[PDB]
Amino acid sequence: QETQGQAAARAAAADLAAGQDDEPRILEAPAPDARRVYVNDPAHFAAVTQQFVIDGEAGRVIGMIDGGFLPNPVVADDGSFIAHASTVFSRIARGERTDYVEVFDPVTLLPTADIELPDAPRFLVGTYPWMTSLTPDGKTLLFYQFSPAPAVGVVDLEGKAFKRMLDVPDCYHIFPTAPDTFFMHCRDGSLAKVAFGTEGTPEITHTEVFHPEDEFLINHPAYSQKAGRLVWPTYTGKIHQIDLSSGDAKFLPAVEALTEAERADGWRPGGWQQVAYHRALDRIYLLVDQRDEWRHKTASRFVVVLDAKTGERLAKFEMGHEIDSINVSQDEKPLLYALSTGDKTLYIHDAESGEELRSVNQLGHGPQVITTADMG
Amino acid sequence: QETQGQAAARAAAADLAAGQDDEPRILEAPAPDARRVYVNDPAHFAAVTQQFVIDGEAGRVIGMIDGGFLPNPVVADDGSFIAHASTVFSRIARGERTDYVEVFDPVTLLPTADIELPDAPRFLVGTYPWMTSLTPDGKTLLFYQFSPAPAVGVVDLEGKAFKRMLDVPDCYHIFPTAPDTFFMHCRDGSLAKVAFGTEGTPEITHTEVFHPEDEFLINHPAYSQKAGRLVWPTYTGKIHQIDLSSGDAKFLPAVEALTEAERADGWRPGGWQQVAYHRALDRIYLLVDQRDEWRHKTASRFVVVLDAKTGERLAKFEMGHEIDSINVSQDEKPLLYALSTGDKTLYIHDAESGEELRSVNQLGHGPQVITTADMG
Amino acid sequence: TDPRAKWVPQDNDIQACDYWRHCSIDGNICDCSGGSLTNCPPGTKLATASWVASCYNPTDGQSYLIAYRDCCGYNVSGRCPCLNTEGELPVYRPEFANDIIWCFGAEDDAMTYHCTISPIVGKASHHHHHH
Amino acid sequence: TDPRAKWVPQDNDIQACDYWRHCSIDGNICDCSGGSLTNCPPGTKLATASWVASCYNPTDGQSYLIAYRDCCGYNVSGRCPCLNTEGELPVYRPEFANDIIWCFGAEDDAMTYHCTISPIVGKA
Amino acid sequence: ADDALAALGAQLFVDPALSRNATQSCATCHDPARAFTDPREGKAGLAVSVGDDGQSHGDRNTPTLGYAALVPAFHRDANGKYKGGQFWDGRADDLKQQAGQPMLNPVEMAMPDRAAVAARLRDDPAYRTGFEALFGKGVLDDPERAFDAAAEALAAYQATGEFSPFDSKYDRVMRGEEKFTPLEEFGYTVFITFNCRLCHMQRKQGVAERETFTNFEYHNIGLPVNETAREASGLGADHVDHGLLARPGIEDPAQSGRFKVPSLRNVAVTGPYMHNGVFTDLRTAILFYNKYTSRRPEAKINPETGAPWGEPEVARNLSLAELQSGLMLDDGRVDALVAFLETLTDRRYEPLLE
Amino acid sequence: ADDALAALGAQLFVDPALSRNATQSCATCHDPARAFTDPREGKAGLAVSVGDDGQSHGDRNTPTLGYAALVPAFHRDANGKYKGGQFWDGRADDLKQQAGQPMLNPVEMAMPDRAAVAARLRDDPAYRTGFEALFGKGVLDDPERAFDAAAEALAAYQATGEFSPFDSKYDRVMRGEEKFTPLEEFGYTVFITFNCRLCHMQRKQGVAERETFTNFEYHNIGLPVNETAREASGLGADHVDHGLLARPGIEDPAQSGRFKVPSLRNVAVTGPYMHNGVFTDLRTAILFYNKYTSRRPEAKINPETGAPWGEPEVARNLSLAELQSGLMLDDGRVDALVAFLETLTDRRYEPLLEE
Ligand code: HEC
Ligand code: HEC
Ligand code: HEC
Ligand code: HEC
Ligand SMILES: [Ca+2]
Ligand SMILES: [Ca+2]
Ligand code: NA
Ligand code: NA
Ligand code: NA
């Protein structure tokens, strides 16, 4: 119950009273661990943005990273580095555009690579995590391009060099499964497997269509790369689960995050990162609330937790704030992270009981994206 | 007292009912006039910043200009252009720094010049209008440099080129009086007159000392270039006035903006732009409130108005908001502009009655500086 | 102001987020930074790409296609922010998607988002979203 | 909270604007963006320049010289903003002036302001 | 009277006595069974038409007369863009001024002069009756009044509902009488969100009452010469078609190579396409716009030839701001656009769609 | 006994019998009338001192002994910075280890060996009584013990209040006994806000109990060779004084050219300045730091010579992070620094300030 600032006052007074000297210096962040959490503030489309690195266990900002216009953050699951693809201009928001990838040491936050992406190829969109994606080995970063057409750029992080663009079909998002392979979701309702290990046009194969034209899959599916599990809610809270763990897509039984009765009573998912997935627990978390069908990007005050294998509901939590995005730590007794864009605050909950443990406020202008590493 | 948005809905509905076609296009701002007011938002030291161009008669934003880190805005008194001295960095707030001047057309707001300043020479400081200044002919911009030592940089706006740095004594601010001459304030309590050429050591003459070492002269004096009048409050609301209209400094009698009783009861000026001066009326306006002696940058809620010749108080207005900066239009029946950093709102008042007439809100993150043209 | 409630259009104030033409706007209303309902502010660049919504106008009971356009090349205005999503579909139906920075075709390759205009281009509705 | 009242120092919470060492701080408290009371956050650069205030410590009744230092090279943190001006003099007495971005000396020529630290350097 | 004028134009329109050898009428090249365009295969396929002499071919493709009555008279607007008029280069101000031109054109109907037209009119007792009732006794004896009256009748006929019936699927859907299929609605959405609506819609904003999918402006979209049509035309390999600059009184070099935006009504049944008929398939016409947006090698290739599209006939004044939109049309959107443009076919031509 | 050991050191300190020709005591070069520095002119002015042979010059400037007793024994701190020790290169661990070295150094007091120092101690009945009382009967008959005892005595003497009285104006102002002038106060504020305090203050933060205006670390501030002193010393034109790397057991090439930060107490009366006495005037020593911050041409010119300062004797390992502060010292602030450094003069040397 003594706060961080109180304990810091007492330690400082004790150092003074004792005559203890210390050298003012640049701190290192504590080693990455399961409870580190990153919050990205796209700042309502501002030309410059921030990422907050937070110790979820103490509820403390441990560092920050500056970014350009709508950057896409990525976090290596083993904690070895973080990176983003970002965009700057020579006169704040006008003039020559430069898109680039930076890789950062996760303790000193110093950039260890800055890799220019030729011809300003990034897709500029409100931040979708799986629009820029690391391969499992951490050696490659893949980012999406929309103009002139869907394409995916390949960045060699080991060699610190942009490699090439891959032409793809009318598809969106990037879920990498191997060092040379990733999946995307097509307009026609299929997934596309894109295998690009050989040079030249990639080998692209489609699944059967897995959803109808009037079923809408949100922009923020959860993807656990270590599980190979893609968890993809629709506007009604029906959840598609695709298992990519064999290297090929297998469609798992669909589950409904809401009952027929709740749906008839107006319950619908809604927010930004609406869904989280805990790998060890094989558990799905979905932000939901009662809303009109076209208020799907508004905050929600409830989270439902359900077993991924059965679809059984395990919990429904009243979060107590207007929450836009959720995520979870991937350890035991995980934390459930609940970010409110409007409050610019990350609320940190016990994922089991749903209870609020601590919060971290003043996180930028319009924070929206939470990212954690799966270090287990 | 239909609002701007209401009038516009009415007009759009009538064009729709009439079948009126119009081409979507880029608007021009209305011609610069005496009631145009600019508000600059240093955004509490953010790396990028905004200026809002406002029609003070309608209370309407008529345009915006982006800037970099703590840029210094200037407005030509005759309405012909505006400009700023600004700073950007290759990776948001890190990397290579570039300092530059941009000149903008005041109707299209397009940059008509972008002039690099070599060796990153600008003084980065919370924004003081008289730290960058136009000569009266509009042809030269002069900017202050603090590091490695006080210096003044000379930028030829007509030739669109950086000219040279002038070494000066231990002095601060820049009040240009002629195409080749300006005054500064020295630490020793004199002013320095600096007269400069394309090459060669400038002629630097000090005036008599005019204040003691324990009277503190604020960072935001008012200076009417067309009147040659430098209006310089101290922390107690004593006002020094210096007449530079002859081309040399003539020290006018000091006036007190506050009475002996008000000072005994805790009244002092306070805010950011604490003082304004209306040239044609020869009137001084000062932000004041009851405060402790070291709360000199806090907002104030009152403005006193005094005759600059006699010191006689003409009015004391209750502003009704936490005001940090004031300025006035320079026309007849002027407007008193009252900018609140905390409310991010410019309140626009009748300068004769003090009445609030209208207000423009959502002016960035921490707007602090108001600038007008003296077109008369 | 219940954010989750069905959005209720008005035809009396274009600077408010419930103005009927803003039914799928995402960003900032250009009339608040020196543009107007259907024109960009000075210094910005008008994109040629667009996103469509069928927006019901409560005045005449008709549904109009509003082909939004971005005004680009400036940092976001910060005035009159609004996000509405009537008929808004996910990114893979990009004709109806509004998180995309639709600055394509803007002069000088301007790609930074300042604000959005709301002009009418037709009278029609959509299978996925009709009154 | 009356912003115009005489500032009242405390020695119990370093993230608050009335913490005694922050008597002439302008900017943001570094402890709130991953630094500490006297250390900069990771990725920022510690300036060598300083500005000084004499700040009364209500714990021991002594006034101490706080030689503030900026942590530079990042956009402003946005967390725990504070502006106090005890003893603060205008720009022409720069040793006591706090609107100046005192990033001089920082590594890599960093000059953007992120946050400020409040180390003691002597008795006043 | 308005009826009588148009009915006299209906007679003239199919009358081959207005051609020198009596082999051709307006209707020969603007065949009403083909949305008033030319079905006849000449030396360059259907790209260009053959005149009354059975050998001369034109250098531009015969356009539909449907909806041509909606086009404003030629003028320069307040932004300095020229709009309206008739012919692909706008050289006629309006339908009355245009009607006389094929009659006297040696590569088309080839009458030697107005007097020869008046003589053929005077030979027909029905025209003596019909023209005198409307224009007064002896009109046919005065070649200038006869020829002007023939032009007025023909222009009146082309302004009747038969030429502009607004009965296409698109019109029915806009009247709320039926719905687009999903592919057609996607196609309409693409049309209004991609660059096509910048040029192929009557207005900038608002709702048009009688939309004809053209803004009546002039644009150079950078088309190559149609080699076989240019050979057939006999104008010489040295010829350059300068479009609007060819209109007398237009001197502005920025107008060189610009042509009138055609109405897309009945486009699906009036191939081949563009001012020189260079593309036979509607899909190729659409794909041509990808040359300015796609970075795929295939975007550089005319799919009807398998070779590059070819350099623009006129390099300058291309409408690059509109054409270089930053977004390409993938094949799905091309399909959707074809589906949409098929809905602009008048009801009586739906059986041609096949 | 603590008193008696120091009193023995007091006698030895002024005793020229500890030099080979009996011409020189510690007090010869460390003259108490001059803050324990050497007033004597030699071939290089006052830059370096002359030994007992009357001919040999050293290569470094004789430093004050005032406040030397506050310096920690030599050690490497955890942040990898060497600190403390005695001599400008820290090659002595502490005062006791330092004290025997001048006695045996042929360029200074030039005694041949310990036995010879012991034989001089024995010749003096007062040393036989004083040493035997503190160290035991027979001490002077054992050269190693006699020599170690003499060093202990000397080190004790230099740890007395006489050498470190803390009675300068600065000390008085800090006790609240009097106030600085506006110019001294300005000087103090410059010293603490500019880069001087990064090296010339005991602590990084907090308040020092007995400030001596050094952090005891080693830095290469990039000084040129003092040519006249280097010629007088005879070490040769190719000699490089590597500072701390010359300490036996330091092998790290990053230490080349680093010298111990001197205490600035008494600096106004202990000219000339730096390890080789290269600058005569205190103002010049302060002006030297402007070569890293000023872009004016004069910044690079030594005002004592009208010529460039010169290439650093050791170009590498310069403390540039501290030295390249981005702010130069204008003449007002150099005046202020001079004023302030004069307040660090001990009360008994205040009379020397005028001259
Ligand atoms: C030999 C074929 C032929 C005949 C006969 C002919 N036309 Fe045409 N028509 C054309 C060609 C080719 C064009 C376009 C030529 C150009 O743009 O230079 C044209 C263009 C027109 C246009 C312009 C439409 C537009 O969108 O620009 C009108 C109107 C027209 N014809 C009406 C007539 C009438 C009325 C007659 C009978 C008096 C007639 N045509 C006889 C081939 C012919
Ligand atoms: C820059 C204005 C402009 C844009 C944008 C534009 N067009 Fe065109 N279009 C024209 C002009 C002008 C012509 C006639 C060009 C010529 O023949 O020289 C034309 C011709 C056509 C034709 C052939 C019609 C006929 O009767 O021969 C079709 C089909 C066509 N356009 C469809 C499209 C579609 C679909 C789009 C969007 C992908 C599009 N246009 C974009 C100006 C435009
Ligand atoms: C010939 C002159 C000379 C005599 C005699 C002399 N010294 Fe020194 N003293 C020096 C010089 C020169 C230095 C610096 C030498 C160096 O750094 O290598 C020095 C340095 C020292 C230092 C180190 C101080 C510091 O800050 O590093 C101490 C302690 C010292 N002397 C004490 C003694 C004592 C005790 C005696 C008598 C036993 C003595 N000195 C005799 C010239 C002399
Ligand atoms: C990076 C560490 C550093 C900084 C910063 C520094 N000094 Fe020094 N100073 C030294 C060292 C080391 C010496 C001894 C140099 C040598 O002789 O090799 C020294 C010597 C001096 C001397 C000569 C003293 C003597 O006894 O010979 C004076 C005077 C001096 N410094 C004053 C200053 C002033 C005033 C400032 C601030 C303008 C300053 N110093 C900044 C390290 C520092
Ligand atoms: Ca055709
Ligand atoms: Ca000396
Ligand atoms: Na051909
Ligand atoms: Na012409
Ligand atoms: Na010398």
Ligand code: NA
């Ligand atoms: Na060594």
